Amino acid sequence: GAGGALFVHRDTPENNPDTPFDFTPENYKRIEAIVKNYPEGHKAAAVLPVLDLAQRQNGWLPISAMNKVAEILQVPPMRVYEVATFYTMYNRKPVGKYHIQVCTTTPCMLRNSDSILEAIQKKLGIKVGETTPDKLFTLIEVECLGACVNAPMVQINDNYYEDLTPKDIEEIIDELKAGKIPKPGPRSGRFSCEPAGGLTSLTEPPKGPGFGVQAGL
Template sequence: MSLALKAFRGAYPLVQKRFGGTGLMVHRDTNDNNLAVKFAFTPENLKRIEAIKGIYPEGHKSAALIPVLDLAQRQHGWLPISAMHEVAKVCGVPRMRVYEVATFYTMFNRQPVGKHFLQVCATTPCMLRGAESITACIEKKLGIHAGETTADGLFTLAEVECLGACVNAPMVQINDDYYEDLTAADMNEIIDELKAGKRPIPGPK
């Protein structure tokens, strides 16, 4: 067996743990992600798309692809194949171009996620500052592992690469908010507040 193949096989379990297997790399029809699932931008979002495209000069409207994908995800909660096709249509680009972008950037969710998407940074600075204890705390509190969603659909847990807040490690991104300098006790309190329907104050603890 070649060294390259050994390295790939060694890395695969980590990729599977952090990103839920090959779900982010290939498309396979499921009950909630297939071409029969309808997606259409709301009238309000269509206006936003025109405003976004207006930022870019003629001949470069396709540069709006990333913000339009983000808008689709915010509307639907994640990006089914039908949403990506609609993005291709409104941006005037081939569907393959949308697939390339949506599968490259891990901020785009190609599988359903919970109302509260907990992303634990697992790279070196956060790891050295106790990220593993934060992940363990979440797993124990919610009864799920990385790549899983709670039965009530409220929480999804993922381990991700650097989120750019190394100076305040360890940290967790929940939806759009950063929670930094965390301890397991802090994480427990944050989850309790989310369960109570509150928005915990983001930032360093």
């Protein structure tokens, strides 16, 4: 339905221009490496990665992080505010340690994505916008993740977990709670985008270097 998130900023004691934020020296080295890729005089092009880098160090993006990126790149702060509010991967509010994103678009929904969503909700006791009181998990729904063949699928902090049933997602949650990391990929003995049984093509050994090369080359 409606977004729910506000696109204005109101200062809070935990999120104000004086909230402490600064890059680590290693992050400054990474910022220099990011900046070098773009042509000189076009330094702003680094707003998208560097902002992400800030979120990768802090967890979310306080207004002070946006101000720091704007000052480092010498870009007006409103431009960084525009970038932060435009893209949905930027967290302008704190999230849990593990950000569960379940796809509910049509190809993913046709393979019973609602079963996964309800299983997650009954396993965690939270809704599709809330954060668990332990501050470990946050559940939201997202549009197509590009893993439609493997639907139903879930994305957690850069890991795809695909071909899910309620039991698989519940045990992934259990493994994530007990201090372990689960292996990404399909959860049905597939480990690819292959057909679920038979491997209809790509069975013969791949051709060698120069097999089909044309004459005169």
